[PDB]
Amino acid sequence: MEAVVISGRKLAQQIKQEVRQEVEEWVASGNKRPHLSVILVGENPASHSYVLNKTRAAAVVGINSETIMKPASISEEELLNLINKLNNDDNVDGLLVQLPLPEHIDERRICNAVSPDKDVDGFHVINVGRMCLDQYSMLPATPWGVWEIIKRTGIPTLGKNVVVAGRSKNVGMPIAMLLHTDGAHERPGGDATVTISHRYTPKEQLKKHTILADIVISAAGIPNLITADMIKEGAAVIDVGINRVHDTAKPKLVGDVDFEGVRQKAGYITPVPGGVGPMTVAMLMKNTIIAAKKVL
Template identity: 30%
Template sequence: MSARLPLVLRQLGRPPPRPGPPRRLRVPCRANSGGGGGGACWEGLRGQRRQQDGQARSSCGPGSPAPPARDSIVREVIQNSKEVLKLLQEKNPSFQPVLAIIQAGDDNLMQEVNQNLAEEAGLNISHICLPPDSSEDEIIDEILKINEDNRVHGLALQISEDLFSNKILNALKPEKDVDGVTDINLGKLVRGDAHECFVSPVARAVIELLGKSGVNLDGKKVLVIGAHGSLEAALQCLFQRKGSMTMSSQWKTPQLQSKRV
């Protein structure tokens, strides 16, 4: 979620489209408490992060620079997004950034994380919750509605991998495709026009985290494991732009399984 914030705000800097007929935004879906409540999930996630960051720092050898804590990187992204939003609203006070998330399934933790990060950055979220067994046509119908809603600046899909068909992905308007999954955005990235398209925020976050950790990617051999589709393509492009030679593999590859301890 934090990686998407700059992309949504960048979309705000573009000339606004002509206003169309107003359409009421969906009421954000609420996460089930699950006994501990949504807040407990969020606190648990932050506690887990703090524990992992402490373990990472303790594993550094003498004289080794401590890797930046992930919480501090998230704070930096949120602060940068706030500053960009402030500049945009100074030019046009009526701008209110809205990210729509179409979710098919129950992922209460991600709902809570998205909402908390968005509130901190000043981003409004419209959560459209669909049943886990939603059909391709039902998901596309929701996408088309969001495409035509001029108050929504970005659209992300939170659906199972088996629903990521070309028909669904390319139903998104490329200018609202903050995850960079449409053929148009991927094509521009592969062609070298990364500044003219949306790039997978996960892929960009990987490159940024490696850079902040002091990793020089030039001349390195990089094995990308477990990524596929648009994420795999984006990672390969970004690594190659940094001078790396990339290879891809899946977790179930026999050679990888034989190396497990």
């Protein structure tokens, strides 16, 4: 028993090639080349890196892009004015605001200002609602990337035990929603039995649910939250965390999972970096071509 390491990087690169073919055919049919606009506020270094990866991926798949960078001191009204400009620009197919934003800007007001037709993050209240009702919607990139990892790997979900650690509205909540819901609904779900945990779940209780799990998805942002004692043998372990830590001098990226210990016990495991992160970027490229195609 040693875990298969699922390369999120490799799977993402493949999906990007699928999107490239689709974009290139869309353009060859006489359509406007798709354009993604990303708004970046302030100087969070994680945000700058993730956004650079989004724009590199857009170039790879033939989508035009711009990153618009504003100071953290921008007002909410100034950001709204920019959004309304880009909502009215017929060259822009996809529009997203990188999170998190400064405290003085209301994130949900910003997310709801993006025209739902251009809402490639799936964060507008109508996309959130439709998703929670298992209707067709623009799915958020990270949750859909987690789903794609599980399904493209052929890891089964129907009747299975799943634990999600984390309940954030952009990651943990939608993963739990996708995994537990009906396969027969308009937007199929995974028909798993899902346990959601969070900052007030006691360690010992997390463990008692993880030990029954066929799939553990950690989305908490806590190094070594998940260790091999907490995992049953042959389980799939998906690490959504991206934690900036220091070593052994260097700054470095680790996940929520003790990768070395857990790879001895799990059947499957994703690494950090190169796991869920690149899949987030690929699923965004998928949403952008879907948005440009005005099919939803």
